[PDB]
Design a protein around this ligand. Sequence first.
Ligand SMILES: CC1CCN(C(=O)NCc2ccccc2)CC1
Ligand SMILES: CC1CCN(C(=O)NCc2ccccc2)CC1
Lengths: 193, 193
Amino acid sequence: GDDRELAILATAENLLEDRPLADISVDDLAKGAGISRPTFYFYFPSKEAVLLTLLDRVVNQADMALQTLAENPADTDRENMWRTGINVFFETFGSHKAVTRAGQAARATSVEVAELWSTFMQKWIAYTAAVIDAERDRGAAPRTLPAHELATALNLMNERTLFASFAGEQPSVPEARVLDTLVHIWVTSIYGE
Amino acid sequence: GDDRELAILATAENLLEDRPLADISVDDLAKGAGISRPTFYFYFPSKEAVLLTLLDRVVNQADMALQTLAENPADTDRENMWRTGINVFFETFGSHKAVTRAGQAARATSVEVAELWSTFMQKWIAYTAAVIDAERDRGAAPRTLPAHELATALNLMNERTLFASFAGEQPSVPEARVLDTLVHIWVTSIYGE
Ligand SMILES: CC1CCN(C(=O)NCc2ccccc2)CC1
Ligand SMILES: CC1CCN(C(=O)NCc2ccccc2)CC1
């Protein structure tokens, strides 16, 4: 049932590792999943819907990991607190590079992919700002920029920098240096006057 | 001669203001430029080459403005020094939003557009790092992150944040707040321990 669904999704994630969605056919997904083409179309209307689902799963997985962290504070300095938070996204997206890369590209052509990405970005920005505000209310951070604006820029930094590193873009921060790079800019910009 | 060339480029920039390149035909560009379709193909092999040229012009214009600034230091504090530098890109790209938006999209489909963007990003990052290093050699900034890595992340931040603001993406920093937002993160991350 959804064993077939899960097989289709697993096949698609596997094939995206070697090639873009444009070079993957419904027939490729059916064959890998051990079903016919019409059987495929029972579970998904298009290969594009498969990618949307894969992205939805990855994004929700990151979001659920952040909710877990938010409910269960690590017992640590402010630097480590932000590092642990950024790390949810580094590891989650980092563990699904093909889906991340394909899903980012699909933002250009798919309103549903764009709206999905937008919804979660708003959520993560709102959460970032809430934490900055808490830190300001505690007297741990200075009241500099509007928190929501600072959060927006920091979140967009992370999007572009993590994804360029994962894709090995020229230029990009090496993947083994990206977490430390982002944490420094977050801590100095949130705590610095 | 290149009056016809300049007319084709001006027409394309105008039409990109109302619609994507995919909804602009060679015939639209010819007609706007006051020439026939075969006459068009004398100046450019495709509508895609027209966009490449427009982007090349905008990018080189920003780069020439930064070279000017680099040769002629504004007489001012470190915050204003970075603000003046970021502002070259805010105003240059900000004055050509349609070309900026279309050129960024074309990175996905055009190797020449990707390689153009990559070449200048490397250049601007190398320049950013050189300035950070100078500031460190002067004893004006602490030796924190590797300068080239810090420069990379800051430059990618600016790319994503400026372009999201210009496109009115959800989410995005409002255009009237983006310069101050980026300057704060640059100054605190370059000067902060
Ligand atoms: C509590 C914060 C921890 C840091 N954090 C992120 O890294 N940013 C979210 C982000 C946005 C785009 C792509 C990757 C990740 C947001 C929530
Ligand atoms: C001396 C610095 C001043 C600040 N600066 C920029 O804003 N970054 C370059 C950039 C990169 C992508 C898109 C827009 C602009 C780089 C050179």
